[PDB]
Amino acid sequence: MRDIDSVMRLAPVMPVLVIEDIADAKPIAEALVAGGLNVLEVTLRTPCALEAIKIMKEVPGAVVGAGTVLNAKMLDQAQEAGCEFFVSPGLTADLGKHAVAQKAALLPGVANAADVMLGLDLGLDRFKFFPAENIGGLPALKSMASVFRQVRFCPTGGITPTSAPKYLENPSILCVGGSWVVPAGKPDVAKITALAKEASAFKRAAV
Amino acid sequence: RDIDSVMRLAPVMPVLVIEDIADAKPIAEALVAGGLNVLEVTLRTPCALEAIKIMKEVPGAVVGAGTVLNAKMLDQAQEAGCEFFVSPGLTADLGKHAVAQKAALLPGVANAADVMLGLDLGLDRFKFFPAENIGGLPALKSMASVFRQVRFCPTGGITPTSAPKYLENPSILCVGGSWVVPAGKPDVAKITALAKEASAFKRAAVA
Amino acid sequence: MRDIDSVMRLAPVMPVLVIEDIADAKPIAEALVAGGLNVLEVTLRTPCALEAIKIMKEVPGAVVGAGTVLNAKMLDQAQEAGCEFFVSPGLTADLGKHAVAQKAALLPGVANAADVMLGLDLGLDRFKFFPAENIGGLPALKSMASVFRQVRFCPTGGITPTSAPKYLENPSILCVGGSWVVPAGKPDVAKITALAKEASAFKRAAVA
């Protein structure tokens, strides 16, 4: 299936989903897909997360992945649930070696040059710049992209509707991760779809 | 004792710098009398190993070593009787040595790759260090939101008025602090008064 | 011959060179040496970078190194090109292990305590603080230098002519990395030599 570069190009914004109630999963996936945000990152931060992946996987148009993958075992459990891609807050050689060996579409987080160097040693060149606003923001990413010209990025962490277009004007950025499209209360599918359509319209220099 | 239990004993772990060996016993006595029985003695001073042996004989003191940079320093602190060990950062070498030695290590972390390295080694308790140069409480709040099973001790720039704000987060078990021992000759009544105030800090993690 | 500590002490500023045209390599190296900045870091960020290193090495007095070295094979390629030192944005165990094996004067980037501890475990004690203005600046470097008292640093990343003396007042700092002496665009050899002479006169608490 798709490699992580192809996943990143599909939509300007990758929603970062924290499912506290399993009944929220289907309405959230349907509303995001209705708004054109087809790429869904379900963080493995809650007990029902893997079940939420199995529910969202059956929504037509949804490209479901697992976030907060911390090790090869969690990548395996998420892949067995049907995840098409995997995101991690940071990178280890054991996690990256396992993803390459399994041909899993992994998007590891990086915060500094040594993280990126470990990723390049493993054959990876696509990373989440995370957590963006705690590690110097767009100016820090602009410098890191200047050092690693063959790498492309997905900043995540404190991104907003106001700052997302600024990141997306950089050619080295393919998309951003975002939490604002689904507010942490009970889902409102109309509001979620309207935020998704608004984010769907964001300009991308790289696409 | 394991590091999670050590962190839960008191809201503040004093970070002690003993330059005058004569100060060690009165300081540890005053801190214990004030309810701060967990003592981190930095190894940087020449008399630090001798100070650890004196503090270990104070009843109720739980004495550990700070600024542990490598396996050799850990072995020296363990030979001196330290019950726990604190490092500014984490290496695979120091971590595998602490696990093999059954040493209660509390390694510093600054980013997700540091945490994931520790989790791969079996560690899940970390010092968030240097806290005020890596984004403070807002950055720690995000990191704790990602690593739901990890618990932290922020250290580096913590003050008596900022410490309660960190302690409102249940992922924070305690803070490290330098203010409980004022510079100059020890005033045992003043140290015990500051210690009693710190021992009364409320924390969401421990009733 | 030279270890990385001796390279850092040669001049207050190590220019961070990005060569977009091979024809500019010789004039830039000659202009820098004429201004007294003999230590030249050619970043491996453009395809012609290794070719530019071979050209600059022929300028008398030039001490040529490679920057943005990402792995052990890249260090070997830069060494075969004639580099006398090597700079890396970060540190991996594989890169540091190969550098110590080959006695290569490596200056690896650090941003946090785990980076420094990995370098110390390899026997390294000289690091660039990079990228300085995105990882907390001088206040962050001050705290890190007070943790690792035996380590000495080269801050790089957003250093300016105004801020370089501020960093160079700290005795834990041996030099700074800078881009302002040879910025982007076609070289101005008169401007480069003049900026190199001003950088050469920067006071240093550590070196004198």
Q: Where are the alpha helices (DSSP H) in C82-132?
A: 93-101, 113-121
Q: Which conformational region is residue A202 in: left (phi greater than 0), alpha (psi within -120 to 50 degrees), or beta?
A: beta
Edge-to-edge strand list for the sheet holding A39-43: A152-153, A126-129, A106-110, A86-88, A63-67, A39-43, A13-17, A176-178
Bridge partners for C150 per DSSP: none
Instruction: Report the distance separating Cα C25 and Cα C205, nearest Å.
Output: 32
CB C78 within 8 A of CB C95: no
Single-letter code of the amino acid located at B191: I
List chains adjacent to chain B, taking adjacency as at least 3 C-beta pairs closer than 8 Å.
A, C
Q: Identify the H or E element spanning B163.
A: helix B163-167
Catalytic residue among A41, A84, A166, A191: A41
CB A58 within 8 A of CB A25: no
Three state DSSP letters for C136-184: CHHHHHHHHHHHCCCCEECCCCCCCCCCHHHHHCCCCECCEEECCCCCC
- Coil, strand, or helix at residue C65? strand
Instruction: Collect all residues with Cβ–Cβ distance below 8 Å to B55 and sequence separation of at least 6.
Output: B24, B25, B27, B28, B39, B41, B61, B63
Instruction: Report the distance separating Cα C81 and Cα C48, nearest Å.
Output: 12
Residues of B in contact with A94 (CB under 8 A): 120
Instruction: Report the distance separating Cα B75 and Cα B91, nearest Å.
Output: 16
Instruction: Report the distance separating Cα C178 and Cα B104, nearest Å.
Output: 43
- Going from the C-alpha of C91 to that of each of A54, A128, A179, B134, B162, the distances in angstroms are 40, 19, 32, 19, 34
The residue to which tokens 């091979």 are assigned: C22
| C113, closest residue in chain B (CA to CA) | B89
CB contact under 8 A, A91 and B114: no
CA C43 to chain centre: 9
Binding-site positions of B for pyruvate read: 44, 67, 127
Edge-to-edge strand list for the sheet holding C39-43: C152-153, C126-129, C106-110, C85-88, C63-67, C39-43, C13-17, C176-178
Instruction: Report the distance separating Cα B60 and Cα B54, nearest Å.
Output: 13
Buried b (16+ CB within 10 A) or exposed e, C101-126: eeebbbbbbbbbbbbbbbbbbbebeb
The helix-helix angle for A189-200 and A25-34 (nearest 10°) equals: 40
Superfamily of domain A1-207: Aldolase class I (3.20.20.70)
Q: Where are the alpha helices (DSSP H) in B11-135?
A: 24-33, 48-56, 71-79, 92-100, 112-120
CATH of C1-208, one of 2.40.110.10, 3.30.450.20, 2.60.40.10, 3.20.20.70: 3.20.20.70
User: Is the peptide bond prior to C108 cis by the omega test (within 30 degrees of 0)?
Assistant: no
Q: Which experiment gave this structure?
A: X-ray
CA C129 to chain centre: 10
Residues of C in contact with A147 (CB under 8 A): 45, 68, 89
Residues of B in contact with C113 (CB under 8 A): 87-89, 108, 110, 129-130
With 0-12 / 13-18 / 19 or more C-beta atoms within 10 angstroms meaning exposed / middle / buried, residue B8 is middle
DSSP for residue A66: E
List, in sequence order, every beta strand (DSSP E) within B140-191.
151-154, 175-177
The residue to which tokens 């396996």 are assigned: B71
CA B20 to chain centre: 21
CB A152 within 8 A of CB A126: yes
